[PDB]
């Protein structure tokens, strides 16, 4: 119970937050308007019964110590739906069955490549089939660059997309992914099935009713 | 993994046979990392010390008719309430929850 | 499965943009995408009939992700 | 906390011999809003038992939370029908009380 | 060698005999009762299995389906059982390891053989669901152990005994009704006053091979159960017993004469009377007692043949016939069951063609003959030909045209 559920404090920055419980080692803000501060040490944890609601660029941030405002990893990627927010899709990419295709989608959220879902678009929508994107060459499914290269195998399909925010692997599966909003067990034996979105569902059903007649681009994105 | 079974097989009897397997790892390492329970393969060490145990236990012999009669004993030491929650569950959405008729209130 | 059911696309690729596609891709011998006695029309969910069981695969895999007159292209096994 | 027992009791042997086990093992209570109804009244949580052969009976709690057990059963895999009526109802077929607690 | 190790899988080999029995017997848990209810009409002291759970096939509360069959698993229970005690008696009577383990150690392979092979070769060959039996029992079939009248234990061939019967007394007034009232007999009828003699050569060289036969039966019949077991019983029964006895003539024995008391019947053994026949037809004797045995064994299987030979003789020709097709197919089944004609003359089509590439498949007209060279099972024919699909391997509809492929000139 080291953790921390500061809110109340997107201006905020992580040398700001950890400025003020200086010693937290790990200090990792969500998109939305809450951050967790987490200290190495016993004592120097019980920051919530010390310095709560403590002014943080002149504004006020409750601090409890617990899970309230928030292995395989999740590709957190806020999927907007043209100039709006579709809904902040955390498909938790199954590493457990396609690690590899996994990795290629927490690091295409994640932007670390250079390249990814952090800003590309989903050209690919069919409606309850599939939602093909993280091109980030030709935009269209055609282009995209696995780690290996412009093509890379895929890892396994020992998942199946047998709900909705179930995550593949789309092509042979280099930069393109596909999110599944139903049942694709047609499709199985050539796209990997490597996520199962346990938060987010509603965000890919809201990029399969939109799918393309509306520019789906997760602009904002990460692990 | 024939040779990694033999070395377990050999730690397990001299553990069965309780301190050589942990003497040799201080004085030796990565060959002696069985004993470990950071590895899955502690619950087959233990296993096999304690078939090796029981193998040295003896050391008599089995008399088991005897061997049918353990055999029918190991025999004898879901599926209709798994088929009534799906006829439940076909139930509840085949009857329709729109025609409430309030007979009590709280 | 020697015929591959494309589909996935309007009547702008119609069968003959079918065809069209499989001399892109991967080629189809015959197309059985017939229409009713009032319409007349082809709407592009057609059995593509490739020249091979692996020809209607490799329209099945390579060929479905077309953006097929503004839709996404896809190609069963038949 | 608060709780809402509502026991309704079929026919004393009267109408139910009138019968080849279609679909008779159990009423279930699922809490329907009130906001769409064959829907004058709304805002409204009605825990409605229907059966097959016997008509559904709704009891009315205005609480939104009104007796929702969590974690009561010590990890049982029983789905059934809903989750309010596989915690807190009971299915007696033999005295054909079912009640929704 | 290590011989504790090898005591050790030894005695996971006897847990991993006793759980494949185990899971047979869940199962078919018929099979067990059936063997119990068997094995309770030759051992009395053994305690008796549930009727109902035996009639429903269950051992606790799962009821069992019905499973020729109960005569492959009695046959593949044997087997283990032989498997599990000869383990048991081969068993019956640390650094330097490790050391030697490091030895060869870059080999790219699986070692996972030590304790799996004993469960799966004992489980109850076959690739998913072929054959009840396990792996050491799946040649095992009941067609070179019983007749085809018998139909795996179910019945006793008697109409070669009848047929041995009639011609040891060398007539044709012997029919084969006669033979199964006259062999039901065999505690003291068939040793004074039975259908043949004692001692007759005729009658006692067709009996010895009898008695042997219902023998052979009654072991493959009780062969779950204790065969050595119950012959050693009823070897210990006729050493203790004085087993005839009579109220005015006393003892008789098997001399075919009887004694005034029990004290000469003791003492005519002494005598020069009765140890010529002991030491003359002991093996006559032997042989009409283990008939005697096996008849009282399998006398429910001997009403069953007489029945089967009644339903037989009193049945039409037709009858008799499907009768024989049944009990065959019963005997020879497995144990676990699973337009013009001026289209035709001015096209063509009144003359067929073969094209030797596709499988030599024939078609109607030289028009779909020389459209064999674009199709899809005649293109798997030039793919097994190795010539490319082209216009040359097309222009040829014989397999000799794949020596002129493009591995051929360049
Ligand atoms: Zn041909």
């Known amino acids: 119970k080291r953790v921390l559920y500061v809110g109340g404090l997107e201006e905020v920055d992580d040398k700001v937050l950890h400025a003020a419980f200086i010693g937290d080692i790990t200090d990792i803000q969500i998109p939305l308007d809450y951050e967790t501060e987490k200290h190495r040490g016993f004592a120097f944890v019980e920051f919530e019964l010390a310095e709560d609601a403590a002014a943080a660029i002149d504004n006020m941030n409750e601090s409890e110590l617990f899970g309230r405002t928030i292995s395989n990893p999740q590709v957190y990627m806020d999927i907007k739906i043209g100039n709006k927010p579709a809904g902040r899709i955390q498909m938790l990419l199954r590493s457990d069955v396609v690690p590899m295709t996994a990795e290629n989608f927490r690091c295409l959220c994640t932007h670390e490549k250079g390249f990814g879902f952090k800003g590309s678009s989903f050209h690919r929508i069919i409606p309850q089939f599939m939602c093909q994107g993280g091109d980030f060459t030709n935009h269209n499914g055609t282009g995209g660059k696995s780690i290996y290269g412009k093509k890379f195998d895929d890892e396994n399909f020992i998942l199946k997309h047998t709900g909705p925010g179930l995550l593949s692997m789309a092509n042979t599966n280099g930069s393109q992914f596909f999110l599944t909003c139903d049942k694709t067990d047609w499709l199985d034996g050539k796209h990997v099935v490597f996520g199962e979105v346990t938060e987010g569902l509603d965000v890919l059903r809201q990029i399969e009713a939109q799918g393309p007649k509306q520019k789906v681009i997760i602009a904002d994105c990460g692990e | 993994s024939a040779f990694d079974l033999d070395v377990v097989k050999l730690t397990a009897q001299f553990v069965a046979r309780r301190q050589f397997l942990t003497q040799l790892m201080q004085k030796e390492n990565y060959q002696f990392d069985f004993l470990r329970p950071q590895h899955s393969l502690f619950n087959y060490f233990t296993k096999l010390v304690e078939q090796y145990t029981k193998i040295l236990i003896p050391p008599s012999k089995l008399k088991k008719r005897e061997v049918l009669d353990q055999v029918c004993y190991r025999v004898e030491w879901r599926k209709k309430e798994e088929e009534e929650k799906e006829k439940e569950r076909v139930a509840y959405a085949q009857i329709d929850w729109h025609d409430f008729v309030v007979v009590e209130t709280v | 499965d020697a015929t591959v059911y494309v589909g996935g696309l309007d009547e702008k690729v119609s069968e003959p943009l079918l065809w069209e596609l499989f001399l892109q891709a991967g080629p189809v011998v015959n197309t059985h995408m017939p229409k009713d006695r009032v319409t007349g029309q082809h709407q592009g969910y057609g059995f593509v009939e490739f020249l091979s069981e692996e020809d209607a695969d490799y329209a099945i895999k390579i060929m479905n992700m077309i953006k097929l007159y503004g839709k996404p292209i896809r190609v069963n096994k038949a | ?101 | ?410």
Request: hydrophobic residues 30%; glycine residues 4%.
């Open chain 5, 1 to 410: 060698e290590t011989i504790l190790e090898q005591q050790r899988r030894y005695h996971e080999e006897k847990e991993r005999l006793m759980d494949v029995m185990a899971k047979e017997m869940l199962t078919k848990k018929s099979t067990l009762r059936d063997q119990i209810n068997s094995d309770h009409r030759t051992r009395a002291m053994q305690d008796r299995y549930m009727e109902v759970s035996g009639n429903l096939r269950d051992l606790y509360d799962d009821k069992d389906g019905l499973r020729a069959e109960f005569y492959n698993r009695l046959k593949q229970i044997k087997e283990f059982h032989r498997k599990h005690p000869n383990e048991i008696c081969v068993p019956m009577s640390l650094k330097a390891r490790e050391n030697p383990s490091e030895e060869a150690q870059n080999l790219v392979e699986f070692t996972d053989e030590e304790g799996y092979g004993r469960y799966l070769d004992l489980h109850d060959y076959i690739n998913l669901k072929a054959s009840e039996k396990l792996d050491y029992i799946t040649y095992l079939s009941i067609f070179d152990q019983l007749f085809d009248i018998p139909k795996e234990r179910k019945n006793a061939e008697y109409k070669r005994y009848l047929e041995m019967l009639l011609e040891y007394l060398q007539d044709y007034t012997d029919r084969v009704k006669p033979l199964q009232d006259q062999n039901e007999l065999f505690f003291e009828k068939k040793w004074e006053n039975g259908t043949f003699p004692g001692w007759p050569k005729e009658t006692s060289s067709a009996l010895t091979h009898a008695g042997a036969h219902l023998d052979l039966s009654a072991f493959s019949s009780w062969e779950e159960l204790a065969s050595l077991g119950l012959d050693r019983l009823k070897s210990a029964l006729l050493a203790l017993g004085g087993t005839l006895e009579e109220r005015a003539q006393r003892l008789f024995s098997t001399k075919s004469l009887e004694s005034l008391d029990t004290s000469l019947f003791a003492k005519n053994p002494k005598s020069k009377g009765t140890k010529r026949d002991t030491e003359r037809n002991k093996d006559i004797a032997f042989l009409e007692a283990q008939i005697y045995e096996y008849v009282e064994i399998l006398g429910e299987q001997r009403h069953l043949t007489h029945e089967n030979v009644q339903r037989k003789q009193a049945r039409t020709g037709e009858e008799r016939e499907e009768e024989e097709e049944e009990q065959i197919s019963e005997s020879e089944s497995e144990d676990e069951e699973n337009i013009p004609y001026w289209l035709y003359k001015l096209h063509g089509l009144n003359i067929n063609y073969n094209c030797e590439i596709c499988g030599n498949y024939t078609y109607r007209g030289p028009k779909a003959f020389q459209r064999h060279f674009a199709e899809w099972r005649h293109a798997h024919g030039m793919r097994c030909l190795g010539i490319p699909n082209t216009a040359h391997f097309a222009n040829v509809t014989q397999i000799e045209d794949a020596v002129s492929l493009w591995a051929k000139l360049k």
């Open chain 4, 1 to 101: 906390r608060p709780g809402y027992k509502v026991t309704k009791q079929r026919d004393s042997e009267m109408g139910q011999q009138s019968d080849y086990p279609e679909i008779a093992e159990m009423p279930r209570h699922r809490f329907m809003s009130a906001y769409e109804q064959r829907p004058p009244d709304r805002r409204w949580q009605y825990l409605l038992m229907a059966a097959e052969p016997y008509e559904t009976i709704a009891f009315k709690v205005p609480s939104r939370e009104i007796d929702k057990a969590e974690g009561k059963f010590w990890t049982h895999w029983n789905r059934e029908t809903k989750q309010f009526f596989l915690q807190f109802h009971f299915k007696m077929e033999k005295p054909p009380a079912p009640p929704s607690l």
